[PDB]
Paper text:
Here, a method for presenting crystals of soluble and membrane proteins growing in the lipid cubic or sponge phase for in situ diffraction data collection at cryogenic temperatures is introduced. The method is a variant on the recently introduced in meso in situ serial crystallography (IMISX) method that enables crystallo­graphic measurements at cryogenic temperatures where crystal lifetimes are enormously enhanced whilst reducing protein consumption dramatically. The new approach has been used to generate high-resolution crystal structures of a G-protein-coupled receptor, α-helical and β-barrel transporters and an enzyme as model integral membrane proteins. Insulin and lysozyme were used as test soluble proteins.
The first protein used for this purpose was [name], an alginate transporter that resides in the outer membrane of [name]. Because the crystal used for data collection was long (150 µm), it was possible to collect all of the required data from four separate locations on the one crystal in the IMISX well. 20–30° of data were combined from the four sites to give a total of 100° of data. The crystals, which belonged to space group P212121, diffracted to 2.4 Å resolution with a completeness of 90.8%, a CC1/2 of 0.62 and an 〈I/σ(I)〉 of 1.45 in the highest resolution shell. The corresponding electron-density map was of high quality and the model was similar (backbone r.m.s.d. of 0.599 Å over 403 residues) to that obtained using crystals harvested from IMISX plates with data collected at 100 K, where the resolution was 2.9 Å. The data-quality and refinement statistics were comparable between IMISXcryo data and the previously published IMISX data obtained from 175 crystals at RT. Dimannuronate, a surrogate for the alginate polysaccharide transported by [name], was included with the protein during crystallogenesis. The expectation was that it would bind in the electrostatic pore midway across the β-barrel through which alginate is proposed to pass en route to the extracellular space. However, density for two MES buffer molecules was clearly visible.
Author numbering: 40 to 96, 122 to 192, 202 to 440, 455 to 490
The structure:
Amino acid sequence: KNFGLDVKITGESENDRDLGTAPGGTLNDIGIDLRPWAFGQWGDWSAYFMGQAVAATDKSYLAAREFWVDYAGLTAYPGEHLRFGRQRLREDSGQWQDTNIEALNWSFETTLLNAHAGVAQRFSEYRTKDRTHVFGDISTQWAPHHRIGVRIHHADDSGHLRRPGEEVDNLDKTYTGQLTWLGIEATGDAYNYRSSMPLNYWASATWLTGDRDNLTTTTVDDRRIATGKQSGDVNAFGVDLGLRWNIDEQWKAGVGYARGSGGGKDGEEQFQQTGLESNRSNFTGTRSRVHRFGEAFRGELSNLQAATLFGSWQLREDYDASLVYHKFWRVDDDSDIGTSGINAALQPGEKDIGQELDLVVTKYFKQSALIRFRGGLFKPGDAYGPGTDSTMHRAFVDFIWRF
Ligand SMILES: CCCCCCC/C=C\CCCCCC(=O)OC[C@@H](O)CO
Ligand SMILES: CCCCCCC/C=C\CCCCCC(=O)OC[C@@H](O)CO
Ligand SMILES: CCCCCCCCCCCC[N+](C)(C)[O-]
Ligand SMILES: CCCCCCCCCCCC[N+](C)(C)[O-]
Ligand SMILES: CCCCCCCCCCCC[N+](C)(C)[O-]
Ligand SMILES: CCCCCCCCCCCC[N+](C)(C)[O-]
Ligand SMILES: CCCCCCCCCCCC[N+](C)(C)[O-]
Ligand SMILES: CCCCCCCCCCCC[N+](C)(C)[O-]
Ligand SMILES: [Ca+2]
Ligand code: NA
Ligand code: NA
């Protein structure tokens, strides 16, 4: 299989990203994502290319999603390889990195020890100032399916931010500086959708230090507008804890707790994620990756506390369903929260961000095809005040064909 084609037909429904407090924030659009790919393997050499042709109801583009060359001949370890090019950098939680980026990444994956060491930097986004990311991890499977690892991420950004009044696109920097994340992780089939254990867990504690400049934004008629900048020394903490009960081979239910520290005049104790994260994982124990902090809220571990309750059902490799409840609060009731899904203004003094009920339902067909519903229903809390819509939703219907 030197080539193939993924055809994703998606329908997104977004109402309303600003909770009905600003013009914009709505979507009811369809799109086609055509991802031709080319994989070649000549011994220890392996080259891959994935293209992307997207047309949505406007947003019409072409991109080189992945383009890498890989060398596996440094060591006899079949899990050891050096990947160079625009590659997928993903760790199981999606909380450090889950993105396609030009990187020089070294993997060493053995049953007892896992180790990664890479450098990533965007030179383009290959669609129709910069940041250096330096990272590494070392984990040990101390007991079957039980892991304990330390993870490091450094972001070097000598760049600058959009000035107050200017608009901020998604391709823009929201932060600069020198930031080191040092995390301690322990997992027991944390993201294993087919687990041999009645209990799965994840437990992560991360320390963020450094110098950081970061944007403070607002929304002005569907446009993200820079309102200023926080310039400080960072000393922040992030935590994610979860327990998943595998009631049986189909039924799962679990609890989660995460906290991304918040606060400080210039965000001294405000935790943040690397900016390479997707926050998508199989934390509900299904094949379907669910947004860890709601499909609607799209929380980013930054001045955020999240309590999660989830129920899931996986039928063989045919069906999966995940019902996810989250309650969101800020740590500091005068700081902004990390969210990629809600841009509505927050009323100072109010900790209660909201509540969310997510449903992810997928039907798989070997017919190489899947029909997925990923939807978040967010109930705005007191932090967003009165006048807001009683609820917000983001729902997607994906129809994927893999050839
Ligand atoms: C083009 C409009 C944007 C799409 C918004 C999503 C529509 C939301 C709800 C209505 C459809 C409900 C059924 C979803 C579906 O077909 O997937 C479920 C299926 O995979 C397994 O039962
Ligand atoms: C050998 C034992 C392994 C455990 C070592 C891993 C834990 C190390 C450090 C935890 C980071 C805590 C940082 C303490 C801190 O908040 O100091 C900042 C303070 O000066 C400002 O309030
Ligand atoms: C920019 C380098 C990575 C992109 C290359 C895409 C992988 C295919 C390599 C071309 C050779 C194919 N083959 C096997 C037919 O010889
Ligand atoms: C060994 C060198 C391999 C050369 C193959 C080059 C493949 C890249 C294809 C460019 C496609 C870019 N885009 C954006 C138009 O899709
Ligand atoms: C064996 C190559 C992998 C190296 C990856 C780096 C792992 C992170 C360890 C950071 C060191 C911090 N400290 C204070 C714990 O020593
Ligand atoms: C061995 C790595 C796992 C460490 C995770 C445990 C973190 C401590 C839990 C307390 C959470 C409370 N708080 C307020 C600090 O967020
Ligand atoms: C809210 C998420 C946590 C729910 C998990 C509750 C534990 C499983 C209860 C089922 C126990 C019955 N049993 C023994 C037949 O398995
Ligand atoms: C025009 C399309 C409208 C899409 C409506 C879908 C709302 C998202 C539902 C999230 C799941 C929560 N639940 C269980 C209450 O349905
Ligand atoms: Ca609106
Ligand atoms: Na190797
Ligand atoms: Na599971």
